[PDB]
Design a binder for this molecule. Structure first.
Ligand SMILES: N[C@@H](CCCC[NH3+])C(=O)O
Ligand SMILES: N[C@@H](CCCC[NH3+])C(=O)O
Ligand SMILES: N[C@@H](CCCC[NH3+])C(=O)O
Ligand SMILES: N[C@@H](CCCC[NH3+])C(=O)O
Ligand SMILES: [Mg+2]
Ligand SMILES: [Mg+2]
Ligand SMILES: [Mg+2]
Ligand SMILES: [Mg+2]
Ligand SMILES: [Mg+2]
Ligand SMILES: [Mg+2]
Ligand SMILES: [Mg+2]
Ligand SMILES: [Mg+2]
Ligand SMILES: [Mg+2]
Ligand SMILES: [Mg+2]
Lengths: 296, 306, 296, 296
């Protein structure tokens, strides 16, 4: 099986005058590459998938692919949708425009059954010939991909090689790798990156790495080298910033932090996302003071 | 200039017994001629309003063109009758929801339903700005829609009341949260709003506390019973309304043994009201066990034909 | 069946120098009788069941029985326990000492199965010949008595006549009375007293009635006569105090309010229960100013 | 601080004819000592604390103390209660009768505030001079000891040295040891024993070790010696039995399994606990067949 693992960043999407700032997007991706990141994920939840147009979603995949040329860094394109026909179209676009793989979030809002989830992902995997990583985040979608469904998809479909888990459920992470140890479990919760890696997870798809790419990369690579002491030391040091980046719904805090660090020009969202409360803005600024934030 | 005193300024409303219409498919396309026939069946069985393309209508998997087409068919079919069209126009992107709202206005809908943004979990401030922009885009009634089990977010009682008091067109909320405490909270602090039940099994408890209508899944199958329940309740004949709500519990519950609208489409198919048990992925046929369970509950109810 | 319905009060237990103030207990119950209450419940959760000794628990049942002699008010003695042999002993004491019926909370902490709950209540009901009211409060016990178990118990044991529901689940209340309309459903959540009664419930067991017995009494009797408009008006007017009485864990706010109204001499709890925060103390006082509180 | 760490067993309490089988209890403890277990915990939830009399609870502490005398195995006596005066009395008994420390579950059913929890445990810790381990299990108690309260108690009272966590929340486990790495975090959920130990936890209090003391012992000692690969291997191999032992509420499955293994003479509980369902009886019987169960 082809795989995409290691330290990965769920990229924020910067706006200027309501438009995607395509030149700041490329600059932010190069900053990730230059700080030890193994792959980048354009247009996930962190990238404001919901409020981009279909053209804008596709444009950001192209920029990521272009920016990573000549490097070892891969593009795991965000291509999920709650409509199977939309998700297949995004999968085919990413394949035909040079992405190395795709991420595929579980359908949100319409709550498919486990059978429907299996048929949803089977259609996606049959549409392309590049790796497909499942993405489970029940707090946002309203549904859960069960362990049985995940494992069945891993064994029945060639391109499906693992799952990104954002469920705060370490028991399920043990369940997954105890019954299918060949799968690639990827952490989708920054605060518990180390516990997932220490149980055999093979990477992270990170919000914090937008701000601190070198620290997330070092944490992951320490763990992959079985230097558990050093990986845990970074995970413990990062807890305070990992928590404050979710005081409000992601990506509101991380964009606030990137703005306070001078890495994005303006603190701009697309509705229904908005600026954080003045209280939480001050809380984020205060937590940041304990970390050394790399520039460009 | 904006202000905070819209509560008692005359708000156009859409209340009574309302149906969240299923969307029939034929060879993967919207069966536009079965859609019109089903809406006419609703009109002839005492329903006061219809809601095209909600969650029950598989809004998520329809294209933008198909979503707009189904609103047009509903508007056309209810012309010359007392039945209103409350167009489903929600989106998790504010610019999409504004575009749908303006479409519904410009093509003759009587009002709009607007679900709270799903998946991206906006803050209460974000929800306020989301709804504020939608309501300022049109001049027809806007009913908020709270269903946290599907969206991942909740519109607070405080936010709902602020929107009611700050914007002219927001006139109430459809609640699908299984939280009768919140329903008491809403009408005790803002009794001028229209609380609409979005949970069939508890239609009567919501109406008995001052709710003014239902937006029902069960009425797809049994429109006469849901309409009679509501009109009994609106006339304060609570004994007869409760008697029907009790009779419908078994079917109200079994219609969610799997995720709506999988059971209701199965039942409409078992009743001969649609030609195919067709969904758009990721939705699918129910399990064989749940199929039998649905068939088996239906037998105790009288289902009106065409 | 023989039943105990209507407006009922979950009595607070006052302490004086670390012992139960038995003369304040009697004075408080007499205040309930004179303000339209139909029954009183000694030693529930509100009465600090957990921290009373077995002798004090039994003494408090005795005081309630004595005080309601010669009146229309009944005593529904609190007799629950998470050990069946303890719950049987309390039930038999209540019977032998003149209680009109018993309330029996579902076993807490040890989480029995539905089969175990059935055997638990069957042994209790067979031990006495007075009415037994089940009590479901999953947020405190960790278990739920299923609708099926409640209906089975109602139909299989002669003296079990209903359930007190404190689960915030109006769907379950419709389920209960649609499938077994002969049972007595009793509200155990003050804020939704009117919605439960309007669906056919026949009474409440109230925390707020400790402070405002006349208002809860009028609400219940209005509703039982199908004067729903007048009952809803009181339920709506009581929402603010109904909510603030749970700003902290019951019975901390209600005992605070009774002290703030001068109805008890000292604001004393038994650890692990404690006085509320300074802020919540002031918040309860401010909500109270909007209500008419009867004295002695 | 004095501490009690390592691989520990939450002992089942066998009954025979409705009484505690005191000779089987001692025999079971000797089996634990002989399989590398570092300490035993009499009368927890697994020991049916709720349904034992005050005298039976105290007797089982005495049997554990006597059976482990002259050996290296410690006794961490279960002494919790939802009434502070009861918990202090149990704590003093354990001290006066030779226990090495005490475990003290957070108060169940009456839901104290964080301030009440602090005063509850401060009173317990001041009553004795032996180590005190807190016990958080919100699914059974209805309350949670916050990270702040645990750390404050650890820093303010000499005897309080850690917490047994049974909340399925690895984020909280990272939170605890990142802000107070000197405390002893003890796993209270068998399925995730290895992830908690891999983050710096120093022991387990196990249900599964009743049946497989050698395997739980080996898992813990592998982890404490930083052989993470071998500890994970055992944790992964134990997942199936760890899960089936909670198909129904603990200790119903574990007693069933001990009965099926011939380690106790009768499968009898005290109401409200009861035998499992017939299908669940068969399910436990299977999972056991994949494991090698040591005898006496
Ligand atoms: N509002 C749409 C937009 C999708 C286009 C970007 N992926 C959704 O969240 O599904
Ligand atoms: N999957 C998209 C499609 C919307 C198309 C119009 N109903 C969504 O649910 O937002
Ligand atoms: N702590 C004991 C007290 C029993 C005394 C009677 N309520 C319990 O909660 O079960
Ligand atoms: N049922 C009481 C009795 C305890 C006696 C031994 N701790 C309780 O669970 O607290
Ligand atoms: Mg995706
Ligand atoms: Mg700046
Ligand atoms: Mg006409
Ligand atoms: Mg909508
Ligand atoms: Mg107000
Ligand atoms: Mg009781
Ligand atoms: Mg008791
Ligand atoms: Mg009258
Ligand atoms: Mg204990
Ligand atoms: Mg735990």
């Amino acid at each position: 099986k082809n795989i995409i693992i290691g330290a990965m960043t769920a990229l924020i999407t910067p706006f200027k005058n309501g438009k995607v700032d395509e030149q700041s997007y490329a600059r932010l991706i190069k900053r990730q590459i230059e700080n030890g990141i193994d792959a980048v994920v354009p247009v996930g939840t962190t990238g404001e998938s919901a409020t981009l147009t279909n053209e804008e979603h596709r444009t950001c995949i192209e920029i990521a692919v272009e920016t990573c040329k000549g490097t070892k860094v891969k593009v795991l394109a965000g291509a999920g949708s709650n409509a199977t026909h939309e998700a297949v179209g995004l999968a085919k676009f990413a394949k035909e425009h040079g992405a190395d793989g795709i991420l595929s979030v579980a359908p949100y809002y319409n709550k498919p059954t486990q059978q429907g989830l299996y048929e949803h992902y089977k259609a996606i995997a049959q549409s392309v010939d590049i790796p497909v990583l499942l993405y489970n985040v029940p707090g946002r979608t309203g549904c859960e991909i069960s362990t049985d469904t995940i494992i069945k998809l891993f064994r029945d479909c060639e391109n499906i090689y693992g799952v990104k888990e954002a469920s705060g459920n370490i028991d399920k992470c043990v369940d997954l790798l105890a019954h299918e140890p060949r799968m690639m479990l990827i952490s989708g919760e920054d605060a518990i990156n180390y516990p997932i890696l220490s149980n055999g997870g093979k990477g992270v798809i990170s919000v914090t790495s937008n701000l601190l790419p070198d620290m997330i990369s070092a944490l992951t690579h320490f763990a992959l080298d079985e230097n558990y002491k050093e990986a845990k030391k970074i995970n413990d040091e990062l807890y305070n910033i990992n928590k404050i980046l979710f005081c409000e719904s992601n990506p509101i805090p991380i964009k606030t932090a990137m703005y306070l660090a001078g890495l994005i020009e303006s603190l701009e969202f697309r509705l229904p996302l908005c600026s954080p409360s003045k209280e939480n803005f001050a809380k984020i600024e205060e937590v940041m003071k304990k970390y050394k934030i790399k520039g460009f």
